[PDB]
């Protein structure tokens, strides 16, 4: 609850903002509006653009690359809102920036933000 304190990851609840994969998420957890950890809700469109962070998993002690992808074409879900910024860099380093609506490549040119998914796409380094 102390907003300024060093963020502490857990691996026990994906709908909470301290879940380890959400280390640089911005928006809403898709699992809270009909998606899942790594899937979009019905009626939305999955973007191909992504932003990246290395998120430490407290369970196995390993650091993974989480490629955050947006689900687009819907108004913001308003469920499970989170903002974390582990390793997050300013806009001029866009690959690591998370104020950007990463809806690029979404079907039907969908560009409105609904929610973000948190898939692992590799090991850090």
């Amino acid at each position: 609850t102390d907003p300024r304190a060093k963020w502490v990851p857990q691996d026990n609840d994906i709908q909470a903002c301290d879940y380890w994969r959400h280390c640089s998420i911005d928006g809403n957890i898709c699992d809270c509006s009909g998606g899942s950890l790594t899937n979009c809700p019905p009626g939305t469109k999955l973007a191909t653009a992504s932003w990246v962070a290395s998120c430490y998993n407290p369970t196995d002690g390993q650091s993974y690359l989480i490629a955050y992808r947006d689900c687009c074409g819907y108004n913001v879900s308003g469920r499970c809102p989170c903002l974390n910024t582990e390793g997050e860099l300013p806009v001029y380093r866009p690959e690591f920036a998370n104020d950007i609506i990463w809806c690029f490549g979404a079907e039907d040119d969908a560009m409105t933000y609904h929610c973000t998914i948190s898939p692992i796409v590799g090991k850090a380094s």
Partner: protein, 376 residues
């Protein structure tokens, strides 16, 4: 005791440890069932709004649908589609107005029809379910127009086109009984039966007057289309029941949801969707609380359950929250849905014991309207 977020965290960890792959994709909502529940959020007159599709058994959001200014949701009882009549503007809340109907596939939630309504004919009002209504065959959508005069718009869902406007007398609400017939409630205290065609003045016949001018019939009656039962409370919790199953209005004996003592002590119905009706059980559910007579729109903390035939009280539930709207699932061992506009939360109760089972929070800005399908 394990939450959905915990179960998913467990599953995700197992997948990662097992090296299990899966393709990020667009999920389908689970097949429509009796325990699906829709919650609409008119968002206190915000120019855009949201519908929440919920699995009531799990208490999980399984989908959402965007809408514009005060849309009217409908749900096909057979679970084959959902639809709304909605309103948008070219510059958020200003500029050119477009009224339209969308029909949605119930599992993909993709629009399968977008039917424009000419001359912006929608009635803009705090959301009343029976201001827009499907015919029993689900082929026609009927919407109310207030301006410039009471009228009913006919939308052909099958052919995906607007048909016509119907001139009606000074009457309100639309309770369909047949592919070509609906009833309305009139200012004069009668019901109006409207039997319509593709062209020509519809056959309009009034029932006899069934209530005095100083009994006030709430804007949210419960109507069971499959039963042909209109359950209409007054401000005092007196309940009018009209049997429409024959195609014509049959007035049932009035029942009192509250005892004479309770009424003497300030018990009145209150909220938004104050009344529910379970078809198979023939039961009436009413949101009631101790209140001043002109606080008829405030939340209530109690539901009374009563037999429709006898008027005998079967239960009085202490809800434990500020409840504005109720509805029930239409299956065996039904759920009692209890929506709190203030909490932005759908509370899910066992309708037999009144016990709170689970809850679904964060439901927009001011959710008010609960809809279920009667698939029984």
């Amino acid at each position: 005791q394990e939450t959905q977020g915990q179960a998913a965290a467990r599953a995700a960890a197992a997948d990662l440890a097992a090296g299990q792959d899966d393709e990020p994709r667009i999920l389908e909502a689970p097949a429509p069932d009796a325990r699906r529940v829709y919650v609409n959020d008119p968002a206190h007159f915000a120019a855009v709004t949201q519908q929440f599709v919920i699995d009531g058994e799990a208490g999980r959001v399984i989908g959402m649908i965007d809408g514009g200014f005060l849309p009217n949701p409908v749900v096909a009882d057979d679970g084959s589609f959902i639809a709304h009549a909605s309103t948008v503007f070219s510059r958020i809340a200003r500029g050119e107005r477009t009224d339209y109907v969308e029909v949605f596939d119930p599992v993909t939630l993709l629009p399968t029809a977008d039917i424009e309504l000419p001359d912006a004919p929608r009635f803009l009002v705090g959301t009343y379910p029976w201001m827009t209504s499907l015919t029993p065959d689900g082929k026609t959508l009927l919407f109310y127009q207030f301006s410039p005069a009471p009228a009913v718009g006919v939308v052909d869902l099958e052919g995906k086109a607007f048909k016509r406007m119907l001139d009606v007398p000074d009457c309100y609400h639309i309770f369909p009984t047949a592919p070509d017939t609906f009833f309305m409630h009139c200012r004069d205290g009668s019901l109006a039966k409207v039997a319509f065609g593709t062209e020509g003045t519809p056959e309009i016949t009034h029932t006899e007057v069934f209530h005095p001018e100083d009994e006030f019939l709430i804007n949210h009656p419960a109507y069971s289309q499959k039963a042909g039962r209109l359950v209409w409370p007054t401000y005092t919790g007196k309940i009018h029941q009209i049997d429409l199953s024959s195609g014509d209005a049959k007035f049932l004996p009035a029942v009192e949801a509250l005892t004479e003592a309770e009424r003497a002590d300030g018990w009145r119905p209150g909220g938004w969707q104050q009344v529910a009706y379970h078809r198979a059980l023939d039961r009436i559910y009413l949101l009631v609380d101790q209140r001043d007579e002109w606080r008829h729109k405030t939340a209530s903390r109690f539901v009374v359950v009563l037999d429709a035939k006898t008027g005998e009280r079967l239960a009085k539930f202490e809800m434990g929250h500020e409840i504005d709207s109720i509805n029930v699932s239409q299956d065996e061992k039904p759920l009692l849905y209890a929506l709190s506009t203030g909490d932005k939360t759908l509370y899910i109760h066992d309708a037999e014991s009144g016990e709170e089972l689970r809850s679904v929070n964060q439901l927009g800005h001011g959710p008010q309207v609960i809809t279920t399908a009667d698939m029984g």
